[PDB]
Design a binder for this molecule. Sequence first.
Ligand SMILES: NC(=O)C1=CN([C@@H]2O[C@H](COP(=O)(O)OP(=O)(O)OC[C@H]3O[C@@H](n4cnc5c(N)ncnc54)[C@H](OP(=O)(O)O)[C@@H]3O)[C@@H](O)[C@H]2O)C=CC1
Ligand SMILES: NC(=O)C1=CN([C@@H]2O[C@H](COP(=O)(O)OP(=O)(O)OC[C@H]3O[C@@H](n4cnc5c(N)ncnc54)[C@H](OP(=O)(O)O)[C@@H]3O)[C@@H](O)[C@H]2O)C=CC1
Ligand SMILES: CC(C)(C)c1c(C(=O)N[C@H]2[C@@H]3C[C@H]4C[C@@H](C3)C[C@@H]2C4)cnn1-c1ccc(C(=O)O)cc1
Ligand SMILES: CC(C)(C)c1c(C(=O)N[C@H]2[C@@H]3C[C@H]4C[C@@H](C3)C[C@@H]2C4)cnn1-c1ccc(C(=O)O)cc1
Ligand SMILES: [Cl-]
Ligand SMILES: [Cl-]
Lengths: 265, 263
Amino acid sequence: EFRPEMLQGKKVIVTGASKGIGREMAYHLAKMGAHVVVTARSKETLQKVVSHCLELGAASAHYIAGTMEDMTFAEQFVAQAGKLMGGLDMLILNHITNTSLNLFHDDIHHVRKSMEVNFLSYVVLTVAALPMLKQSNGSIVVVSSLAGKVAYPLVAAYSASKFALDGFFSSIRKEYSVSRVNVSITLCVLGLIDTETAMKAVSGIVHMQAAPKEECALEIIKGGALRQEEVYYDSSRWTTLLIRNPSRKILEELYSTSYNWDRFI
Amino acid sequence: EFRPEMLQGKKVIVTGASKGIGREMAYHLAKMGAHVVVTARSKETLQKVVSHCLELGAASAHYIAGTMEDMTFAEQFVAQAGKLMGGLDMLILNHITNTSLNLFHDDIHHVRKSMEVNFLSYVVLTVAALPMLKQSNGSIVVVSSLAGKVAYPLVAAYSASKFALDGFFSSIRKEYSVSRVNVSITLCVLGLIDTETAMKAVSIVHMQAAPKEECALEIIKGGALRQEEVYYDSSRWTTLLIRNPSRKILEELYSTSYNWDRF
Ligand SMILES: NC(=O)C1=CN([C@@H]2O[C@H](COP(=O)(O)OP(=O)(O)OC[C@H]3O[C@@H](n4cnc5c(N)ncnc54)[C@H](OP(=O)(O)O)[C@@H]3O)[C@@H](O)[C@H]2O)C=CC1
Ligand SMILES: NC(=O)C1=CN([C@@H]2O[C@H](COP(=O)(O)OP(=O)(O)OC[C@H]3O[C@@H](n4cnc5c(N)ncnc54)[C@H](OP(=O)(O)O)[C@@H]3O)[C@@H](O)[C@H]2O)C=CC1
Ligand SMILES: CC(C)(C)c1c(C(=O)N[C@H]2[C@@H]3C[C@H]4C[C@@H](C3)C[C@@H]2C4)cnn1-c1ccc(C(=O)O)cc1
Ligand SMILES: CC(C)(C)c1c(C(=O)N[C@H]2[C@@H]3C[C@H]4C[C@@H](C3)C[C@@H]2C4)cnn1-c1ccc(C(=O)O)cc1
Ligand SMILES: [Cl-]
Ligand SMILES: [Cl-]
């Protein structure tokens, strides 16, 4: 179904691309011959990722360094990236604030910082990217987790922010259908993935088994390119089968049928 | 299974109690003879509510007016309410920032205000109530929506905040089990309900609303019975289809596979 030629010459933004899954996606897009604008806080690591993207064969690879804590950076970054590539075809929202496995006690500051970085910044980015994506019949790719579909201990603030992405983007997708906005939204529900961040977070939990970041990153690109609503990627075949909720799809399809919202458009 | 005597003499907080579902819950708790501390921004409507609660037979009814936009109010309110009742048995988190059905365009301010009011304030109130509920083996009751389990158009910021409550509280419930915290968490997944707010928002041809009075009772029954989730819609189709057993199987496998005792 998917072809690598589908990404050739496309204008793609990847957030949290200095390392992990974001970096792997940037490299994948580069091998496919895409124009890429990557971001993270570290200018040096980004410069190393951009250098490799050009070697891989990216049509054009650029970086803009800043913190997604700053909503003015987030808004401006989209404009600057859009000018560099002369448009936008895909927006890959992937960055997250630093998190570790820990019991929740009193950390409102972490809960809010998770909400601002992992969620609000995504909305600010989308808002700023939507005119370019509308004129290119584009794609938003939102990187979530199993922890953003199912409840796990030790990642309460993280789970709260990934659950919010589902609520927001799945709702805005329903709206795009009514308001006939031909911009696709892909929510990526990932299991544990073997990035240095995750592997350092999980050190010692021997029974916990990570999936390849390389294939994971490809599966995210394939999903958005094919305009799929949801992408699932875990190492367990048990999880992949059980993660899907058809009961939700039924309730959503019934409301889509039962109501006409044309007197809002 | 449930008995009204279960709430007699209990120390309950109800947020967003000047109107709608919150008001109805306060009155229900008053009929059952509980000690109640109610909150919303309007002092006068709250005073009329605290006066009806005493007539209905509440053991003690009090009000503290303020905005849950203010996290310091939220934190302090719990301490003050706790002092007025000399403890805390149940925390009923119900308030929300004003929302209407509309397409999302550029409203970051609404998305953030919805997250501060509908979500963060709940975490602030929970943190502040926890020692008191711990010493009383208490209950947190979180009022969510179908829109906090399933995706609907025109309530993006609202859906995002109700989805966050699920993520946060369901995760902390897993933690309370590991850390052996005997404080229950009830998430209430409500369908459309006939409150003036809802009926004004829907003035949506075919939408059936459910009775606010029964709804409010069903929320009390659920928390009192320490149920993890409460479902209340007018459709029998919705109530059957709203449950996610796939996620409970996944949760039970992780509960089994891992031991987190060193946390
Ligand atoms: N790996 C896993 O096990 C799982 C990953 N996921 C999701 O995958 C995505 C990527 O994760 P992963 O590849 O492991 O992460 P990494 O930690 O390896 O990469 C995170 C990236 O985000 C950047 N970043 C961190 N903080 C900020 C900030 N405040 N502002 C801007 N950029 C920031 C980092 O660079 P810098 O610090 O230099 O700014 C880096 O480029 C996330 O959305 C995560 O939730 C989902 C489930 C599991
Ligand atoms: N009604 C329905 O159809 C549905 C309701 N729900 C949920 O049920 C709960 C109650 O809804 P409902 O009774 O219909 O709503 P209402 O609008 O009737 O009542 C909301 C309450 O919150 C208070 N409140 C509003 N803004 C603030 C604020 N900034 N700070 C503090 N308090 C505030 C209000 O008091 P005041 O203005 O005086 O401060 C009021 O008492 C909510 O959690 C809602 O999401 C879920 C699904 C459907
Ligand atoms: C680690 C956990 C639970 C949270 C998880 C995730 C996730 O979102 N992990 C985050 C990543 C970024 C941050 C650092 C690390 C890695 C921890 C978390 C914060 C994705 N799958 N998954 C998971 C792992 C194992 C199993 C299982 O064996 O049953 C099921 C699901
Ligand atoms: C109104 C809507 C969709 C969002 C909804 C809710 C909800 O969250 N209602 C709140 C009310 C108060 C505030 C203003 C309004 C009304 C929106 C919300 C905030 C709870 N069920 N439900 C709903 C209604 C009908 C159907 C159906 O016929 O298939 C399915 C679900
Ligand atoms: Cl890595
Ligand atoms: Cl009302």
